[PDB]
């Protein structure tokens, strides 16, 4: 017997844990999922228990690990996003990056709403920290998805 409040929190915690586990495991995957080769994963979960932004971020991280010219990679990513039908994007990469000191680099394409509950709704955001030569490079990707309609527009027929 466990109370409702207690249960809910516990469930949330479990969800979080699962997510983290997935992140740890699947560096080679276009990960989003969270709905329940894979046999091992299932076993692990049992033991424990008794277009998208995250994927893009992961891809970026992988690219960084591989060792590209950075800017080019970012551009490619942006292009991909555009192809996948995004109204707007934004990527940031801050960290060490070539020089020792500082250096945050923005990469926007289409328009990116930041403030309001629309932002909360109509953007998928993701954050990965790609470990590299002499520290960490800091990805953050932010995608504005196709709307189910924005509050700013007033479409007269």
Partner RNA sequence: AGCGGCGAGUACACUGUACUUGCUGCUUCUUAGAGGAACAUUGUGUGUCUAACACAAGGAAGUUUAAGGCAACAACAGGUCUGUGAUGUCCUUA
Partner RNA sequence: UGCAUACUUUUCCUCCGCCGAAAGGCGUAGGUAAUCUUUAUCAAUAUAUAUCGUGAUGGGGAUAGAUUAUUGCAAUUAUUAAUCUUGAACGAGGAAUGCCUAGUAAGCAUGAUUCAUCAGAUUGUGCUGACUACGUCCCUGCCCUUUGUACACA
Which among another protein, RNA, none contacts residue 129 (Cβ within 5 to 8 A by kind)? Answer: RNA
User: Applying CB under 7 A, which of residues 104, 121, 146, 147 lies at the interface with RNA?
Assistant: 104
**Would you tell me how many other CB atoms lie within 10 Å of the CB of residue 61?**
19
User: Applying CB under 8 A, which of residues 1, 5, 66, 100 lies at the interface with another protein?
Assistant: 5
Site for another protein in 16-55 (CB under 8 A): 16, 19, 35
Preceding residues of all breaks in the chain (C to N beyond 2.5 angstroms)?
36, 50, 147
151: Cβ–Cβ under 8 A, 6 or more apart, which residues?
Answer: 116, 118
- Least distance in Å: CB of 103 to RNA? 9
Question: C-alpha distances in angstroms, 87 versus 82, 105, 111, 144?
Answer: 8, 21, 7, 6
# binding residues, RNA (CB under 7 A): 22
User: Applying CB under 8 A, which of residues 4, 24, 98, 101 lies at the interface with another protein?
Assistant: 4
Binding mask 117-136 for RNA (x = CB under 7 A): x-xx--------x-x--xxx
End-to-end CA distance of the chain: 58
């Amino acid at each position: 017997p466990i109370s409702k409040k207690r249960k809910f929190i516990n469930d949330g915690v479990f969800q979080a844990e699962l997510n983290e586990f997935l992140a740890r495991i699947l560096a080679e995957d276009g990960y989003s999922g969270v709905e329940v080769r894979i046999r091992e994963l299932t076993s692990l979960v049992q033991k424990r228990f008794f277009l998208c932004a995250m994927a893009q971020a992961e891809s970026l991280r992988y690219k960084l690990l591989k060792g590209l010219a950075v800017r080019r990679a970012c551009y490619g990513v942006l292009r991909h996003i555009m192809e996948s039908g995004a109204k707007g994007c934004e990527v940031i990469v801050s960290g060490k990056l070539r020089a020792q000191r500082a250096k945050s680099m923005k990469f926007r394409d289409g328009y990116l709403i930041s403030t309001g509950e629309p932002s909360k709704r109509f953007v998928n955001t993701a954050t990965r920290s790609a470990q590299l030569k002499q520290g960490v490079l800091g990805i953050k990707v932010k995608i504005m998805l196709p709307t189910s309609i924005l509050p700013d527009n007033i479409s007269v027929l």
